């Protein structure tokens, strides 16, 4: 299996293993918009529902999660999903609390994980999967340079029985240097960090 | 979980649970072309490699397989892959021995399973996934009426380290009646079974 580092350090954020100790941060920043396009969203604006959500993130088979720390605050989390070293691939997904939307946290969390997957673990494929209704994330992935492969129609079902479509994007190892360059221009130097 | 029937009966073929007892049929009809675009293809033209392949089909978590019987012969197999009743979806895939290519066996095996998934188990989505190099299967899926959703680039890795692309197709419950009509026209009556 791939052995990831427990911690990462960037110029804007740092990453550490996501744990129950981070639950208070989720409780301090509840906004339904943050979870509306995620799987297994908290079912209610309560500690019980948020605890169930966090336990689900930590318990999904194979999932590796990190809390994203932006200063002295937990900004959200980033997750490596269904890593398959046999096929040199994985899925990556993030969630940021509302106050951090627009900050450098999301881009740098992805930069750190993408760099590690491609350059250290030699992954060939990193996939992103988002709800077709999640236009914001789709715009971020296009800006990132991820390739839109297609739409898996009715790919997931919600608790109320309704279905949603998933848009699949990917970045291949050959494409990583180009994606890396774009991320760096937006994160560092006079151009990304004035 | 979904409980499927052990047996199905059509006008051309019948289905029964795939088992080690069917290994002799695989041994009697070995042709590398039959496995070239499948995952975990037998690594050699030997009983040992074919036994490993069959054991892999029966052992994959969640996979439900049936041998397809065409008369007094085993024509190949059909598989329900990664069934997820929670999301009302599954993947379907078949493999036919060379002498049966072009026969009604492949279409009717799919007809029987598709009809059951959509009409009895109320699946909303049935996916098909094939190698981008497997042009024959892609033509059959387009003829079937499955919708080409996209190409998952470098979605699987082969034992020699090379990568292959997967084309994803799907049939939704709303689309099933139309797909069913096309299959029936080709399988039954003066039009499909003169």
Automatic annotation (TrEMBL), chains A, B:
Residues 13-146 form the N-acetyltransferase domain. It holds the Pfam family Acetyltransf_3. InterPro entries: Acyl_CoA_acyltransferase, GNAT_dom. One of its GO terms (molecular function) is acyltransferase activity, transferring groups other than amino-acyl groups. This is N-acetyltransferase domain-containing protein. It comes from Thermus thermophilus (strain ATCC 27634 / DSM 579 / HB8).
């Amino acid at each position: 299996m791939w052995a990831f580092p427990e911690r990462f350090e960037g110029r804007h954020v740092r990453l550490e293993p996501l744990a129950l100790a981070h639950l208070p941060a989720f409780l301090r920043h509840y906004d339904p918009e943050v979870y509306r396009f995620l799987s297994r969203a908290p079912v209610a604006p309560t500690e019980e529902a948020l605890r169930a959500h966090l336990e689900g993130l930590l318990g999904e088979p194979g999932r590796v999660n990190w809390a994203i720390l932006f200063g002295k605050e937990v900004a959200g989390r980033i997750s490596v999903i269904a890593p398959e070293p046999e096929h040199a691939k994985l899925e990556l997904g993030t969630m940021l609390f509302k106050p951090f939307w627009g900050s450098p946290a999301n881009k740098e969390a992805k930069y750190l994980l993408l760099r590690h997957a491609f350059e250290v673990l030699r992954a060939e494929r990193v996939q992103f999967k988002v709800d077709l209704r999640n236009e914001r994330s789709q715009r971020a992935l296009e800006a990132l340079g991820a390739v839109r492969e297609g739409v898996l129609r009715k790919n997931r079902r919600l608790p109320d029985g309704a279905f949603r479509d998933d848009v699949v994007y990917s970045v291949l190892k050959e494409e990583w240097p180009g994606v890396k360059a774009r991320l760096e221009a937006r994160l560092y130097g006079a151009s990304g960090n004035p």
